[PDB]
C-alpha cells in the first residue's frame, strides 16, 4: 500500500514490499546506483 | 553471387565478433544515462 514510512533513519513515502534480498547483520538500509534508498530493514523484527 | 553472399556473411561475423561498431548508438544511450543520472544526483547536493 502507499504509505509514509519512517524506520529510525529516514523519512519517505512509498510502497513497501518484502523481497528476497539478504542484508548483512550490520547493514541497516541500502541504496541504488542513483544514491536513493530502495530498501530498508525493520529496526524491530528481522524483515527486508 | 559468391561476392554478395560472402559479404553478408562477413557483416554477420563482424557484428558478432566486434560489438563496438554499434557504439554510435551506444553513445546515445550513454548520453541519456549520464544526463538522467546527473539530474537525479543533483538532488543530494546542498547548493549552498
From Swiss-Prot, chain B:
It comes from Severe acute respiratory syndrome coronavirus 2 (2019-nCoV). Changing residue 46 to K: In strain: Omicron/BA.1, Omicron/BA.2, Omicron/BA.2.12.1, Omicron/BA.2.75, Omicron/BA.4, Omicron/BA.5, Omicron/BQ.1.1, Omicron/XBB.1.5, Omicron/EG.5.1. Subunit of the fusion protein that is processed upon entry into the host cell. Mediates fusion of the virion and cellular membranes by functioning as a class I viral fusion protein. Contains a viral fusion peptide that is unmasked after S2 cleavage. This cleavage can occur at the cell membrane by host TMPRSS2 or during endocytosis by host CSTL. In either case, this triggers an extensive and irreversible conformational change that leads to fusion of the viral envelope with the cellular cytoplasmic membrane, releasing viral genomic RNA into the host cell cytoplasm. This is Spike protein S2'. Residues 1-47 are annotated as: Heptad repeat 1. Changing residue 27 to N: In strain: Delta/B.1.617.2, Mu/B.1.621.
Amino acid at each position: 500500500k502507499c504509505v509514509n514510512f519512517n524506520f529510525n533513519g529516514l523519512t519517505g513515502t512509498g510502497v513497501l514490499t518484502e523481497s528476497n534480498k539478504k542484508f548483512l547483520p550490520f547493514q541497516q538500509f541500502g541504496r541504488d546506483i542513483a544514491d536513493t534508498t530502495d530498501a530498508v530493514r525493520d529496526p524491530q523484527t528481522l524483515e527486508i | 553471387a559468391n561476392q554478395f553472399n560472402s559479404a553478408i556473411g562477413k557483416i554477420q561475423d563482424s557484428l558478432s565478433s566486434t560489438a563496438s561498431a554499434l557504439g554510435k548508438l551506444q553513445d546515445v544511450v550513454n548520453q541519456n544515462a549520464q544526463a538522467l543520472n546527473t539530474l537525479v544526483k543533483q538532488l543530494s547536493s546542498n547548493f549552498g
